[PDB]
């Protein structure tokens, strides 16, 4: 049973890496859609001003 905590901490580190990757993916999606919306609105405003 001495090899149980090794696999336990390995699985814990794997789950941590996974949840951090998921958080980073969600943040990238948020940044992407916000950038798209902001660029669209800025282009519309610049066209109207011109």
């Amino acid at each position: 049973a001495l090899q149980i905590p090794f696999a336990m901490q390995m699985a814990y580190r794997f789950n941590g890496i996974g949840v951090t990757q998921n958080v980073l993916y969600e943040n990238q999606k948020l940044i992407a859609n916000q950038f798209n919306s902001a660029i669209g609105k800025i282009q519309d405003s610049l066209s109207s001003t011109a």
Partner: protein, 50 residues
């Protein structure tokens, strides 16, 4: 009776040698078409279960 000859109303761009500056603002084409992941999002999640 003074003559009205010294009144020269200036314009903005009457004839500046026909510059015709081509801006061509490609702001709409600056979109981030992010690629998908390596899978295991709907197939593995439904095949594993519990």
């Amino acid at each position: 009776i003074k003559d009205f000859g010294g009144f020269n109303f200036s314009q903005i761009l009457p004839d500046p040698s026909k510059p015709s500056k081509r801006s061509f603002i490609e702001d709409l084409l600056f979109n981030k078409v992010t690629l998908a992941d390596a899978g295991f999002i709907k197939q593995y999640g439904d095949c594993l279960g519990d």
